[PDB]
Design a protein around this ligand. Structure first.
Ligand SMILES: N[C@@H](CCC(=O)N[C@@H](CS)C(=O)NCC(=O)O)C(=O)O
Ligand SMILES: N[C@@H](CCC(=O)N[C@@H](CS)C(=O)NCC(=O)O)C(=O)O
Lengths: 220, 218
């Protein structure tokens, strides 16, 4: 019986949700309230010493990091390899896109703001940070230059990982459709998935709301 | 025919160099000098629109990101899977450690200080960024609780990835051996591979010297 530990404002938890729904997998969900420091409990640290969400539990085994989890799920459960191609050159693109999300989008763009924001009430955001988010939208627009989805011609876990961060980063910088038409189209396409709302949309809305309620300032 | 594009001070370049050497693969090393903005030319942007190093070229096909390159090299060229185990659960640990390196160590620890430093000449490092680095050492210490290497009982590309970052982070935050004994032992187990200096040491030192010449303060 799969168990996912998380809370839905979290982008990587949402990426796992997307992927479990895409694989038509049932699972138990255990909420870990980061705002009440539940991830810092002795019990949770034994599951995941990095004290992050998501964690996946399967027959006693604990796996963390959304990208590891997503790859594991497709590899283990996928009817075929559509969501995570076995072809090594294809896999290298999916992998690259996910490492891009981990580093550039999630740490560099999002957590770089949200950690001081919710922890230290740092409500002033330097323009150079917003510039970096917009630079990353540009990189995503480049990724899509000759492909319908982030890593090629079909939907993969790279799309799921990337969309979770993109739909959070828009709390700080909107995506200019005139600059980033492909990124814009791609997002609407992901938004069309039957499981999109339940896996990503719901949590994204709650995170965007939390951010908006903090009344941020961009400093030139 | 393998070509690696990079510069030695870059940790993810060094991770690829460590892996190439471990697999004993011939390659051409094309220097792309970030300080001369060689990564921003039309030619390089065609290879990698992210304008990062490393980039790997294999018979004309281009791939980038150290972690993706390392997984690709072991998968394609490894005589066996020891450096990147095929077992899904074992792979999941290797994968997680590499994503940790990408986000927490490299972006959150290293590039967080080196971008302001090299782009904005910010030589004053907020004490809390050093703390965060030390916290990351602590996470690495935990990863080593029941295992001699980062992802289990043998050397993997997770070790290569993490060493490159750790050796760069040392430039800002010394490792206290009384707090992180397992990490300290682990780092010696890497510093000892016969190909360590040529693949990681040289460029790690160069980055240290660049960092030192900037005369930092906390
Ligand atoms: N690379 C990890 C990132 C996980 C992460 O940083 N999650 C945040 C929530 S969005 C978290 O658990 N923060 C609490 C903490 O780090 O203490 C993944 O992809 O799962
Ligand atoms: N996730 C990438 C990170 C690559 C990266 O950020 N490399 C730096 C050098 S250490 C770089 O190319 N900086 C130049 C730039 O980003 O413009 C990887 O693992 O290869």
């Amino acid at each position: 019986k799969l168990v996912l530990y998380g809370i839905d404002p979290s982008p990587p938890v949402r990426a796992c949700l997307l992927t479990l729904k895409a694989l038509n997998l049932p699972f138990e969900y255990k909420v870990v309230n980061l705002f009440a420091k539940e991830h810092l409990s002795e019990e949770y640290l034994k599951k995941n010493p990095q004290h992050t969400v998501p964690t996946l539990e399967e027959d006693g085994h604990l796996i963390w990091d959304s990208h590891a989890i997503m790859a594991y799920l497709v590899s283990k459960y996928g009817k075929d390899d559509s969501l995570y191609p076995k072809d090594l050159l294809k896999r290298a693109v999916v992998d690259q896109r996910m490492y891009f999300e981990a580093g550039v989008l999630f740490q560099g763009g999002l957590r770089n703001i949200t950690a001081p924001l919710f922890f230290r009430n740092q409500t002033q955001i330097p323009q150079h940070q917003i510039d970096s988010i917009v630079e990353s939208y540009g990189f995503l627009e480049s990724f899509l230059k000759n492909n319908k989805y982030m890593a090629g011609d079909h939907l993969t876990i790279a799309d799921f990982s990337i969309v979770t961060s993109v739909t959070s980063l828009v709390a700080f910088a909107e995506i200019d459709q005139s600059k980033f038409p492909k990124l814009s189209a791609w997002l609407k396409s992901l938004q069309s998935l039957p499981f999109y709302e339940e896996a990503n949309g719901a949590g994204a809305k709650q995170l965007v709301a939390m951010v908006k309620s903090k009344n941020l300032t961009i400093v030139p």
